[PDB]
Amino acid sequence: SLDRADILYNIRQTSRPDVIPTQRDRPVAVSVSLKFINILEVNEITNEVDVVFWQRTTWSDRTLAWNSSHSPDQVSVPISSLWVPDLAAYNAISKPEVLTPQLARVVSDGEVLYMPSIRQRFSCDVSGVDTESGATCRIKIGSWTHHSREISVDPTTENSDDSEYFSQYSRFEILDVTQKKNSVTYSCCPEAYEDVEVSLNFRKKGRS
Amino acid sequence: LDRADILYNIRQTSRPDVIPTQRDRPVAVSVSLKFINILEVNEITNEVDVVFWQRTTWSDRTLAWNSSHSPDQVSVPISSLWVPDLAAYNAISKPEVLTPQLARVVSDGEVLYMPSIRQRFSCDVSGVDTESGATCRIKIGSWTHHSREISVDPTTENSDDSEYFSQYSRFEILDVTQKKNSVTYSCCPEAYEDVEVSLNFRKKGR
Amino acid sequence: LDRADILYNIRQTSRPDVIPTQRDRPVAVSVSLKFINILEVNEITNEVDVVFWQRTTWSDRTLAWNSSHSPDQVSVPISSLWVPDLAAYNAISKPEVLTPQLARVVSDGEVLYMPSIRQRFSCDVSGVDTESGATCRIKIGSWTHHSREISVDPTTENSDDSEYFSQYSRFEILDVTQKKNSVTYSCCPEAYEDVEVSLNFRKKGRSE
Amino acid sequence: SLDRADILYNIRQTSRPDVIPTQRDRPVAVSVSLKFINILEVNEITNEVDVVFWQRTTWSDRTLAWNSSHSPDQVSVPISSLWVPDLAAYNAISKPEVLTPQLARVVSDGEVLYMPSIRQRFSCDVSGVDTESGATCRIKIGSWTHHSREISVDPTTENSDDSEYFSQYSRFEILDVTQKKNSVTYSCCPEAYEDVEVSLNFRKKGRSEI
Amino acid sequence: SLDRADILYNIRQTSRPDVIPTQRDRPVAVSVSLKFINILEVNEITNEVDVVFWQRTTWSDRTLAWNSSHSPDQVSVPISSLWVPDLAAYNAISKPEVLTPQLARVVSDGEVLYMPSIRQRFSCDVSGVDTESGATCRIKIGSWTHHSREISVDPTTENSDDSEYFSQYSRFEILDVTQKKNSVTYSCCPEAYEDVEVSLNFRKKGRS
Ligand SMILES: *[C@@H]1O[C@H](CO)[C@@H](O)[C@H](O)[C@H]1NC(C)=O
Ligand SMILES: *[C@@H]1O[C@H](CO)[C@@H](O)[C@H](O)[C@H]1NC(C)=O
Ligand SMILES: *[C@@H]1O[C@H](CO)[C@@H](O)[C@H](O)[C@H]1NC(C)=O
Ligand SMILES: CN/C(=N\[N+](=O)[O-])NC[C@@H]1CCOC1
Ligand SMILES: CN/C(=N\[N+](=O)[O-])NC[C@@H]1CCOC1
Ligand SMILES: CN/C(=N\[N+](=O)[O-])NC[C@@H]1CCOC1
Ligand SMILES: CN/C(=N\[N+](=O)[O-])NC[C@@H]1CCOC1
Ligand SMILES: CN/C(=N\[N+](=O)[O-])NC[C@@H]1CCOC1
């Protein structure tokens, strides 16, 4: 009968926080999905928005796996004990303020789930925020230092309901969210960095 | 035993990253907010900036010692202890802990952590300037531990969350009610227990 | 013996996380604020932003060394020492410590810690612009140690008040009075000793 | 049979973050190049600008080298494991806010690439920002403590589009960027500190009108 | 023969960051000199200024010394590896924001040079800032915990241009800077703390 302590100790002994856990020469498949919680500050003049979102991050490290028939199937682990993908929002203009305890969930099969609530300010299109059509703010998120052969990022294919966890008390409302995959290259070099482009279509609530 | 020995033993047997479940039962965390001040309120953005003592209580029996011929209680830095990963679900700033980050550990293994916190929330501020006042609901629960691992309960002390509130604030508290809740997410089957603190307050005067 | 030996010995025998109670008696902490500046005052919100030296004095006999043929006093980083967990009960910001975080330790084990602090409080600012001025009450005591473990006493040596106060502030100090108190909470039986500092101040250069 | 694990372990064992990796007694050649991403806040009165830029930093540390015949030729490494040039913007008036994960890329030969996205406020000439000619804000960046014999700084010859990665959503636009080398000495002492002077010619966007 | 690595290793082994490096029982001679780079914000009413300056700090630690006939005569060292004087600006109302890499320069003889660029806000006389004569803002800087017998502070009097490194783009200009030695004592106690008093004579540009 394994206990939570044994599970953590095993993770510590095999997990290498600064070493990407590539199997063979294949990329690590990171799933990335934003659930928007609040839109706090919007500036149509500067084209800047301040947003709060849960950044659901999923990937696999099979070296962490254990046998969970007669033991817990999942444990909470501080991210300092784990390798974590070096995700960056490419159009952010502030560092991400992580609001929640920095713990990830590891499952007996080796799936890791890290989902911090983040508050961050972005440069994006705020034109039309006070119209019926609303504004569309595009947020690009991907690895900062790992190219397509080392990390691939994919939008999760979950749920669908956009305003599901969104504050009813915000001054804004969400019309639609669409998450699509992209791939930026830099003229310096031949490698491609995969990203997810989250399109946030929102507008001021108005009237009453 | 000397207080040094007690602390050394706590260090050596405490596991800050390991939830101290007895058997297969959840850890019973008691959570109670005592509001001290309301600093900033915005009826338009529905945001409040509040200061509150977050009284947090739970058991870790591995910490226990024999306190017949020794002190029954010590102050311990939380970095030496497992601490529940509580989050305010509708907070829009990180909690600014104002006070020394020490908890109190009793010889039986009861822990009491009560930081003074300043934090900004998204909640209903409509009616803050009326007789009825506004009702701001703050939900607080574990971020990563579900109902089988952590349960949160509003302390059986159902006394005044007032009585500690600044007389010098521009606002007044009408009522505070602390209730248990249990949220689930459509992705998954697990439930996260929370306490929902309903703060009914209003601006002082006309 | 030299300053290096003194520090090494302090490290070996000092226990920063162990309150140095002699017998079962409380540690007698002396607490005294010298106000240096009043920066910002708000009659509407009842908030003040102040800078003050928080003179803190206590005894830790475990620190003691000889000092016939060695220095009688050293500057020691507070991380090497037990330090009382003082908190201002009506503060609304964390104390911003402006000065190097060193205490002074004497060979007998007397400790003097005196950081310059900038901190914001919730207190009575009514009447700040009158002849009588406002009286802002600041309560400071241990956060986790009750009356049997820590006692706090005002050292009121003496009543000079404006002695170190900035001549360049827009406010002036009329009087400071430091008195002892003892708060209890209805949940629980323990009493927490505090010092209540009454700051009587007013805007300079009034009409009457 | 760990591979990237072995690489990192070996870097830890032989890397000295506090030791400048001079080959012989020659200076370390640090290449420094800004790509401007955003201009956030501009004040013609105070002569202050708030800018976001990628600071492409390149140098050689042969102590990091490994043999990559039967292993990966490149890894991402946290900068705390590496010596990193002590670059400062001389006319900055805020600390650099690093926005991106603090990882550098190390190649098996010991070439290092560190490229943080930085947000920082500067004191520079903002006069004329609202004219056709725009303002020219000069940002000076060099080692803080290493003189010309220990660190040399060279502007890369990217020589490309200036507005290439610049936000279309900024209120400002870039007219031209020119990166040139300089070399300042102080009256106290005989040593010279090499820097790069980045001249940002920008202006408020026109009209939107018709 | 010996290399930068050896030099640093030796510094680590023999340096004691928390131990003042007094030779015999004589004070450590700290030289302190401000070069003003910018004046960012001034408030005539509150008597507050926000300034940026290089704080050139010089002292001797002979325990650090090495050979250097067949090796480098100087190295850059992180200050966390060194003892550093606990200097404080006595009339500061913000903590010093250090803008530059926190490295000092150590010479083979044991001379240390630490020169951080600092941005800090002070309480000083801003009266007359908008006149031809300008204001004179006095900044006092000295040890916080080490008295005259342990640390002495002396102005480097390098007879130079004051506005040499000062921003041409500031709204203010410097008329004169004068650095003189002083010595504060407190009524509680007999010990004297040596300081340097930096007198910044400056004024708003233009408007005439
Ligand atoms: C510890 O406590 C138990 C429980 O009452 C008691 O029986 C035992 O004698 C104690 N042991 C000592 C003296 O440490
Ligand atoms: C300390 O100093 C006293 C001074 O007289 C001396 O008697 C003693 O032997 C010294 N050594 C100890 C025990 O600290
Ligand atoms: C430094 O080392 C060299 C070794 O070649 C020696 O000749 C020299 O005298 C040394 N310096 C001193 C003064 O010890
Ligand atoms: C709060 N939301 C949640 N799932 N969801 O929204 O789909 N799971 C809890 C996460 C488990 C690990 O970090 C938090
Ligand atoms: C964003 N630009 C990029 N390359 N470039 O511009 O030439 N690479 C990402 C960097 C690779 C190493 O650190 C981050
Ligand atoms: C100051 N308040 C106090 N009790 N109370 O408020 O009910 N006790 C100290 C707290 C309990 C242990 O951590 C801090
Ligand atoms: C800026 N001034 C400078 N020299 N000077 O002023 O004479 N050197 C850089 C310093 C070298 C040691 O720490 C920083
Ligand atoms: C500045 N004021 C002072 N005494 N006083 O004001 O009564 N002592 C310096 C202290 C020595 C230990 O920490 C600072």
Three-state secondary structure of C167-201: CCCCEEEEEEEEEEEEEECCCCCCEEEEEEEEEEE
Q: Residue with structure tokens 């560190």?
A: D114
Nearest CA in chain A to D81: A18
State in Å: Cα C104 to ligand 8 middle: 9
Asked if B93 reaches chain C (Cβ–Cβ under 8 Å), the answer is no
Residue D209 is assigned to a structural domain of this protein: no
Angle at E106 between CA E101 and CA E107, to 5 degrees: 145
- In chain E, the DSSP E strands lie at 28-43, 48-60, 74-78, 87-89, 97-98, 103-107, 111-114, 117-123, 135-143, 151-155, 172-185, 192-204
For B12, the enclosing helix (H) or strand (E) is: helix B3-13
Pairing relationship of beta strands A28-43 and A151-155 according to DSSP bridges: parallel
Helix (H/G/I), strand (E/B), else coil: B132 = coil
* Torsion over CA: B166, B167, B173, B177 (sign): positive
Task: Using only the alpha carbons of chain D, give its radius of gyration.
Answer: 19
Query: What is the residue type of A17?
Result: P
Angle at C83 between CA C79 and CA C88, to 5 degrees: 120
How many Å apart are CA D185 and CA E76, to the nearest integer?
18
- In A15-125, the DSSP E strands lie at 28-43, 48-60, 74-78, 87-89, 97-98, 103-107, 111-114, 117-123
Asked if C28 reaches chain E (Cβ–Cβ under 8 Å), the answer is no
How many Å apart are CA A159 and CA E7, to the nearest integer?
60
How buried is residue E123: exposed, middle or buried, by Cβ count under 10 Å (0-12/13-18/19+)?
buried
Taking the CA of residue D93 as centre, how many other CA atoms within 13 Å lie in the half-sphere pointing to its CB? 24
Nearest CA in chain E to C203: E46
Cβ contact A77:A60 at 8 Å: no
User: Which residues is C202 bridged to in the sheet?
Assistant: C172
CB contact under 8 A, E99 and D91: no
Taking the CA of residue B159 as centre, how many other CA atoms within 13 Å lie in the half-sphere pointing to its CB? 11
CB contact under 8 A, C143 and B77: no
CB contact under 8 A, C169 and E22: no
Q: How far is the first Cα of chain D from the last one, in angstroms, to the nearest whole number?
A: 67
Cβ contact D21:D31 at 8 Å: no
How buried is residue D65: exposed, middle or buried, by Cβ count under 10 Å (0-12/13-18/19+)?
middle
State in Å: Cα A48 to ligand 1 middle: 65
Asked if C116 reaches chain B (Cβ–Cβ under 8 Å), the answer is no
Q: Are there at least 3 beta-carbon pairs closer than 8 Å between D and B?
A: no
How many Å apart are CA A103 and CA A100, to the nearest integer?
8
Residue E133: give the domain boundaries: 4-15+25-204
CB contact under 8 A, B100 and C144: yes
- CB atoms under 10 Å from CB of D210, counted, come to 3
Task: Output the domain CATH number for residue A106.
Answer: 2.70.170.10
* Best to test chain D binding among E35, E100, E168 (most D CBs inside 10 Å): E100
Nearest to D72 by CA among D4, D14, D124, D18: D4
Q: Which of B32, B35, B36, B53 to mutate to test the pocket of ligand 6 (most atoms within 8 A of CB)?
A: B53
Query: What is the residue type of A91?
Result: N
Ligand nearest to the CA of E66: 3
Q: What is the secondary structure of C84-111 as a DSSP string?
A: --EEETTBSS--EE-S--EEEEETTSEE
Q: What is the secondary structure of B52-85 as a DSSP string?
A: EEEEEEEE-GGG----SSS-SEEEEEGGGS----
Q: What is the secondary structure of D3-34 as a DSSP string?
A: SHHHHHHHHHHH--TTS---STTPPEEEEEEE
Number of domains chain C is built from: 1
How many Å apart are CA C174 and CA C35, to the nearest integer?
12
Closest atom of ligand 8 to CA, residue E187:
7
Q: Cα C90 vs. chain centroid, distance in angstroms? A: 14
Which residues in chain D have Cβ-Cβ distances shorter than 8 Å to E72? 25
How many Å apart are CA A137 and CA A200, to the nearest integer?
5
Helix (H/G/I), strand (E/B), else coil: C42 = strand
Q: What are phi and psi of C110, to 5 degrees?
A: -75, 135
List % helix, strand, coil for chain A (3-state, nearest 5).
Answer: 10, 45, 45
> Which tokens go with E195?
């300081």
State in Å: Cα E13 to ligand 3 middle: 21
Residue C7 is assigned to a structural domain of this protein: no
Cβ contact D130:D203 at 8 Å: yes
Chains that touch A (3 or more CB pairs under 8 A): B, D
User: How far lies E67's CA from each of A157, E59, E75, E109, in Å?
Assistant: 66, 19, 13, 8
How many Å apart are CA D203 and CA D200, to the nearest integer?
10
Which residues in chain B have Cβ-Cβ distances shorter than 8 Å to C47? 39
**Minimal CA separation from B68 to chain A, in Å:** 31
Residue E111 is assigned to a structural domain of this protein: yes
For D145, the enclosing helix (H) or strand (E) is: none
Nearest to E116 by CA among E100, E138, E95: E100
Taking the CA of residue C82 as centre, how many other CA atoms within 13 Å lie in the half-sphere pointing to its CB? 25
> Which tokens go with A13?
């002994």
Nearest to E5 by CA among D150, D25, D19, D24: D19
Q: Which long-range contacts (C-beta less than 8 Å, at least 24 apart) are formed by B66-72? A: B66/B1, B66/B107, B67/B107, B69/B1, B70/B1, B70/B2, B70/B6, B70/B107, B71/B3, B71/B6, B71/B107, B72/B106, B72/B107
How buried is residue B17: exposed, middle or buried, by Cβ count under 10 Å (0-12/13-18/19+)?
middle
Task: Give the residue ranges of DSSP H helices in chain D.
Answer: 4-14
Asked if E20 reaches chain C (Cβ–Cβ under 8 Å), the answer is yes
- CB atoms under 10 Å from CB of B9, counted, come to 14
Residue E20 is assigned to a structural domain of this protein: no
Residue D181 is assigned to a structural domain of this protein: yes
Q: Residue with structure tokens 């509680």?
A: E188
Pairing relationship of beta strands E117-123 and E48-60 according to DSSP bridges: antiparallel
Q: Residue with structure tokens 């080796």?
A: A110
Q: What are phi and psi of A56, to 5 degrees?
A: -70, 120
* Best to test chain A binding among D36, D82, D99, D162 (most A CBs inside 10 Å): D99
User: How far lies C172's CA from each of B33, C91, C169, in Å?
Assistant: 38, 21, 7
Annotated resolution, angstroms:
2.6
Nearest to C111 by CA among C90, C82, C85: C82
Ligand nearest to the CA of C67: 2
Is any atom of ligand 4 closer than 6 Å to the C-beta of B168?
no
**Minimal CA separation from D120 to chain A, in Å:** 10
How many Å apart are CA D153 and CA A148, to the nearest integer?
31
Sheet holding B86-88, edge to edge: B86-88, B134-142, B191-203, B171-184
> Which tokens go with A159?
């749920």
DSSP state of A5: H
Instruction: State which approach was used to obtain the coordinates.
Output: X-ray
The residue length of chain B stands at 206
How many Å apart are CA A170 and CA A7, to the nearest integer?
41
- CB atoms under 10 Å from CB of A81, counted, come to 16
Residue E50 is assigned to a structural domain of this protein: yes
Residue B123 is assigned to a structural domain of this protein: yes
* Torsion over CA: D58, D64, D69, D75 (sign): negative
How many Å apart are CA A137 and CA A39, to the nearest integer?
11
Task: Using only the alpha carbons of chain B, give its radius of gyration.
Answer: 19
Asked if A158 reaches chain B (Cβ–Cβ under 8 Å), the answer is yes
